[PDB]
Amino acid sequence: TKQAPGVSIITAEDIAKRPPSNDLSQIIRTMPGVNLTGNSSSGQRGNNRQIDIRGMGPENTLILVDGKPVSSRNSVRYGWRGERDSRGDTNWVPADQVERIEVIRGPAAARYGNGAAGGVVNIITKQAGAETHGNLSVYSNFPQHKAEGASERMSFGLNGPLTENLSYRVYGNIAKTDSDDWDINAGHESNRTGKQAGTLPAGREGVRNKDIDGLLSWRLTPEQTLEFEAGFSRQGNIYTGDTQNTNSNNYVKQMLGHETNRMYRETYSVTHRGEWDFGSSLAYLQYEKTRNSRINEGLAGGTEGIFDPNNAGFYTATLRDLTAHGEVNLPLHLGYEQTLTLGSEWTEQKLDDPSSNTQNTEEGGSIPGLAGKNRSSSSSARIFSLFAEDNIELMPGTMLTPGLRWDHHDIVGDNWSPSLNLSHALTERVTLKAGIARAYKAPNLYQLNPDYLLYSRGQGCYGQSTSCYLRGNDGLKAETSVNKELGIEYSHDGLVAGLTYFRNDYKNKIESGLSPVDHASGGKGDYANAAIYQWENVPKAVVEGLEGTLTLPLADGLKWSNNLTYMLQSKNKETGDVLSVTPRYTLNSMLDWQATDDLSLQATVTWYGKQKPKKYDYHGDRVTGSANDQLSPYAIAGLGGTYRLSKNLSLGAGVDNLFDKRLFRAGNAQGVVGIDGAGAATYNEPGRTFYTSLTASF
């Protein structure tokens, strides 16, 4: 089945039948335990939502492609409020070239090591066969309201042998998602007075995609395969006014409709796969080079994450990410039928950022230890990792799975991530599952680099109105989480019913500090001698909720599926504020009618529960007025079909958001001077949208 406790598979069939516009996030997010959320309560860049597992935030969601980590978003400046001006890392593989997606949440994901505290999404691509196969895929959508960005997507796939032991697979994609009109939020905006009069919170960023992958699979022996692949992707945005704080200047307006960031993402990977009597071997080298070219932005206060007119033009941040992976697997007939997996891992992140480390100390006074001018462009970290997993069978149907992961981070120090997963046949129809693991987060190179410096005159300073600096902290402890999960599932003859409880106890979540640890010396006027805060480790936080699935076969022809998220708690236990803002619940329902041999018809509904904004502002003070505004529960319905003309040719068509339920980004969550808060109204919900699709394949 497509749901067990902790885990979800999305198939190619699934992707086919509920096509995403462009980014996979759209379909990935319908899994139990998954939200589409920011990393923080700020609401900053809040139309740039990413995949969240169990309310742990997107930085704790590890994206793999064919088991190889995607780190590209680490090339984007990590801001005061724990957001990046990033669209996330799910738009690198084109929808129609995906074989399947694995979503692994909580204690079952901790093994994957660094940044699987939320969970792991593994995007798996279609591979070459025995014969040569190919495909050509087209999708085009059509919003009812012209404001809203339409999407167009053309991908090709082409696979097979060339020798009896050589195979290849290639794909290409071209896609475009029109940005929402600059003014789509007009009249829904938060109340904006004085200087900040006129200003608009922005709709969805557009994106242009170009993805090209090649693989060779070289099988030199019966029991030896060697794979080479290179990947080339490019995303360039279409700007529609977005800024950290929703303020404007002239440069902003100049760029409306223009490309203001481009990511180039290049991957080369060597993968050797081994299978003999004693068991199975797998090891790879990936080199990921991300170039993040974007218009220079301010780093101070309300100037944080707006285009800086003083210093106009592009800079380029460079991420070199190097990953090497080894495992063997050993069956052991030891009384207990069991299987044993041994592994090393090595990673290096090199970050060059020419712009992030260029906040100066003129207005706030200088900081002992930190040069005010031409501070290093370099951060790096290496993690070395050992692990073993034992997959024990105690008695046919029971499985006990203990594992130890050990990580050496070359700055933060040693981590021990132990794990244990039980699954238990209570009946041939019922399985009880329980898991407790300590998952791992290495601080990001922004949080960790004491040359990385943000400044506020006071509007963004915790526990005061005076000027303050926020500084990187190479002393930081890693984030750990003890993810508990207890679940039950009935599964028999396409009747599936499951309910999981999850609680993640969240130690040393890394966040902008609350207390000053120093005061700067000198500078200008009332701003002189600013406070120094660091990135610190909040001692305790908790998330808590429920995952449900129910699948009823109404007839042979007819399948009713449901996935449930219910978010019980999300508490920073220090401040008492929320971690993420997610909907109180999420119910997805598909009806799948196999209405003929050839035709198949789909109805969908999503219910989103209430959404509540953060309680406290940047000061730690209780928010007031429209900063408290919540989002009411609402639903989104869809009808679609796939009508299959032949073995060679299939067509799709349907409607997202049948009833044109629309929402509009009013701004960020809290008030600043001149810009009333928007509470939970931080994102744009798209309206009615027709779509059509075409797949030719052999």
- For binding to Fe ion (CB under 5 A), which residues are involved? 301-302, 457, 459
Q: Which residues contact 257 (CB under 8 A, 6 or more apart)?
A: 179, 238, 239, 240
Please give the Cα distance from 323 to 347 (Å, whole number): 5
Between 94 and 301, CB nearer to Fe ion: 301
Burial of 343 (0-12, 13-18, 19+ CB in 10 A): buried
Structure tokens at 352: 């060059």
Residue nearest to Fe ion as judged by C-beta position = 301
Phi first, then psi: give them for residue 85, nearest 5 degrees. Answer: -80, 50
* Shortest reach from residue 338's CB to Fe ion, in Å: 60
Please give the Cα distance from 621 to 608 (Å, whole number): 29
* Shortest reach from residue 196's CB to Fe ion, in Å: 12
Q: Where are the beta strands (DSSP E) in 82-205?
A: 98-105, 119-125, 133-143, 151-161, 166-177
Between 33 and 302, CB nearer to Fe ion: 302
Please give the Cα distance from 9 to 476 (Å, whole number): 36
* Shortest reach from residue 191's CB to Fe ion, in Å: 19
Between 18 and 457, CB nearer to Fe ion: 457
Q: Could you tell me if 251 and 295 are in contact, meaning their C-beta atoms sit under 8 angstroms apart? A: yes
* Shortest reach from residue 390's CB to Fe ion, in Å: 55
Between 75 and 303, CB nearer to Fe ion: 303
* Shortest reach from residue 456's CB to Fe ion, in Å: 5
* Shortest reach from residue 458's CB to Fe ion, in Å: 6
Q: How many CB atoms lie within 10 A of CB 554?
A: 11
Structure tokens at 383: 């993690």
* Shortest reach from residue 457's CB to Fe ion, in Å: 4
Please give the Cα distance from 689 to 142 (Å, whole number): 5
Between 403 and 513, CB nearer to Fe ion: 513
Q: Could you tell me if 139 and 692 are in contact, meaning their C-beta atoms sit under 8 angstroms apart? A: yes
| Alpha helices (runs of H) in 23-182, residue ranges in sequence order | 25-28
Quick one: which H or E segment has residue 15?
A: helix 12-17
Between 459 and 529, CB nearer to Fe ion: 459
Between 418 and 620, CB nearer to Fe ion: 620
Phi first, then psi: give them for residue 291, nearest 5 degrees. Answer: -105, 120
* Shortest reach from residue 455's CB to Fe ion, in Å: 9
* Shortest reach from residue 660's CB to Fe ion, in Å: 39
Between 165 and 465, CB nearer to Fe ion: 465
3-state secondary structure of 301: helix
One-letter amino acid at 386 equals L
3-state secondary structure of 74: helix
Between 317 and 470, CB nearer to Fe ion: 470
Phi first, then psi: give them for residue 28, nearest 5 degrees. Answer: -55, -35
